[PDB]
Amino acid sequence: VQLTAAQELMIQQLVAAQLQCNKRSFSDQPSQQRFAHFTELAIISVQEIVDFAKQVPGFLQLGREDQIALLKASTIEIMLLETARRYNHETECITFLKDFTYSKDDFHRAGLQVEFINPIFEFSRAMRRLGLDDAEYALLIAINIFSADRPNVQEPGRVEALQQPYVEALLSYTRIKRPQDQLRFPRMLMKLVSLRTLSSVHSEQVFALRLQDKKLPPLLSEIWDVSHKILHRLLQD
Amino acid sequence: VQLTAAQELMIQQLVAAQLQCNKRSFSDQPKVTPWPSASQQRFAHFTELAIISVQEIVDFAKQVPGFLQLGREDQIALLKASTIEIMLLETARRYNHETECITFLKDFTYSKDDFHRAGLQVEFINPIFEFSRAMRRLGLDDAEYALLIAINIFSADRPNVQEPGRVEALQQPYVEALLSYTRIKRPQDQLRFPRMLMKLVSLRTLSSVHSEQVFALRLQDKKLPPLLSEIWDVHKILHRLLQD
Numbered sequence: 094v095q096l097t098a099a100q101e102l103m104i105q106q107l108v109a110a111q112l113q114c115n116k117r118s119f120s121d122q123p124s125q126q127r128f129a130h131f132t133e134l135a136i137i138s139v140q141e142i143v144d145f146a147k148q149v150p151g152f153l154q155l156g157r158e159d160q161i162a163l164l165k166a167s168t169i170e171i172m173l174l175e176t177a178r179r180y181n182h183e184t185e186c187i188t189f190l191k192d193f194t195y196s197k198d199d200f201h202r203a204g205l206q207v208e209f210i211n212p213i214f215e216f217s218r219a220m221r222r223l224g225l226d227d228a229e230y231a232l233l234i235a236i237n238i239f240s241a242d243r244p245n246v247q248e249p250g251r252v253e254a255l256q257q258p259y260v261e262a263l264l265s266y267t268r269i270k271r272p273q274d275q276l277r278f279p280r281m282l283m284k285l286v287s288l289r290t291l292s293s294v295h296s297e298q299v300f301a302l303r304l305q306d307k308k309l310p311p312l313l314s315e316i317w318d319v320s321h322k323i324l325h326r327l328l329q330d
Numbered sequence: 331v332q333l334t335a336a337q338e339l340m341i342q343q344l345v346a347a348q349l350q351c352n353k354r355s356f357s358d359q360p361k362v363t364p365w366p367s368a369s370q371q372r373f374a375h376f377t378e379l380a381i382i383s384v385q386e387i388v389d390f391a392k393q394v395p396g397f398l399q400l401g402r403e404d405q406i407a408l409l410k411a412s413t414i415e416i417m418l419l420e421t422a423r424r425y426n427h428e429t430e431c432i433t434f435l436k437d438f439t440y441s442k443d444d445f446h447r448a449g450l451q452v453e454f455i456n457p458i459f460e461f462s463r464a465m466r467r468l469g470l471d472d473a474e475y476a477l478l479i480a481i482n483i484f485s486a487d488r489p490n491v492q493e494p495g496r497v498e499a500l501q502q503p504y505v506e507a508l509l510s511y512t513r514i515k516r517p518q519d520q521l522r523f524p525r526m527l528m529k530l531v532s533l534r535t536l537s538s539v540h541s542e543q544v545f546a547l548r549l550q551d552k553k554l555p556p557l558l559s560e561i562w563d564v565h566k567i568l569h570r571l572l573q574d
């Protein structure tokens with residue numbers, strides 16, 4: 094009924110690894126132009142999610158083709174967790190990376206479709222009612238990565254076994270944070286359900302953008318379009 | 331610490347209700363369009379089996395406590411989404427790891443090659459058989475399958491749901507009962523309950539892939555029957571099924 098020393102290190106490692114992501118500010122370094130803006134910010138996020146994944150214990154020990162299969166499916170879902178995490182209820186603006194804030198209007202101009210857009214903002218609202226801290230969001234990401242039900246996964250039994258300790262850690266953590274509220278932990282897990290719906294909704298949105306002459310870049314195409322040369326390079330180096 | 335009398339009743343009548351489902355056999359009663367243009371015969375055979383299953387799931391859902399309390403349009407919205415997911419929970423239940431054959435209704439047993447021969451794509455078939463194997467690894471008893479079906483029916487996340495908070499009002503008691511049931515049954519294994527809830531995540535992917543399968547079949551000149559088209563294609567009979 095209290096976090097083990099092993100579980101405390103795991104959470105600390107994941108939280109510190111999460112802090113490396115989304116450090117790039119709007120000052121920092123560097124209709125149709127608005128689409129090319131989002132892709133570039135997405136590419137930075139994808140790159141950061143790949144490096145995050147390697148730091149998660151057990152991910153590098155899996156076979157290459159499984160690593161890709163997990164990242165292919167989970168990356169958009171990890172992005173949606175992050176957009177929810179620093180969603181501003183007062184302004185109704187979604188933050189990307191450190192400091193890039195966009196209201197629902199800005200997405201409309203980029204050529205995105207209300208079917209895609211409003212469910213994201215709804216999801217970011219619904220997560221707020223939970224009142225999740227940074228440790229919980231971190232464990233939930235790790236749980237999301239090690240999903241044995243993804244397409245083309247060769248070793249489901251391994252992926253399931255790699256997920257188990259993270260589920261146990263979140264069970265313990267939530268029981269300590271809210272002893273009275275036994276059902277908060279289920280409610281958290283039922284957001285993994287919503288992320289799938291959003292994941293397929295996103296796939297319908299990427300396709301609809303292609304019809305209006307808005308193709309994805311090389312990296313974003315590898316993981317979201319209908320060999321993964323660039324993704325291999327990032328998992329190698 | 332232990333179960334309530336109310337919960338013991340709820341679970342009991344849920345399992346007794348799911349017993350009435352899947353009673354129809356290959357030998358019994360009327361006969362289905364038989365299993366062998368040859369591929370069309372196999373497609374038609376599956377649709378007739380599926381129609382029967384839909385009609386039992388509707389019946390089942392109507393005798394769940396609190397379902398008939400919801401508005402007609404909401405009943406239809408939950409059934410339209412959940413029916414395929416309830417059907418895949420039933421395939422996984424009676425999967426045979428010995429023969430690697432999925433069973434529909436009582437004893438309509440089909441292998442992975444039989445689905446392939448009916449024109450079904452690998453992007454649909456592989457996930458289904460994996461799900462059945464993945465469910466076996468958990469090892470759910472009757473009561474657990476019954477509770478997980480009731481939880482699946484009352485998902486407030488569904489398309490075109492008008493009263494989502496009243497749907498989730500009905501779900502919470504089934505989550506509580508499953509939490510306590512697993513706690514009593516296997517006190518030493520706490521990770522089992524979360525894993526069961528997380529299968530609802532798997533059932534959403536299967537549903538979307540199932541929708542993709544339904545679409546690709548149209549290109550083979552294999553169009554769904556009226557009742558199946560209402561729920562899976564892109565609700566006159568389903569309205570009529572909900573009244574009795």
Ligand SMILES: CC(C)(C)OC(=O)N1CCc2ccc(N)cc2C1
Pocket residue numbers: 373376377379380381383417418434435450540544
């Ligand atoms: C191929 C077709 C779209 C007609 O049907 C199915 O997808 N299935 C698989 C699920 C299922 C479940 C129960 C029954 N009786 C039939 C089917 C056919």
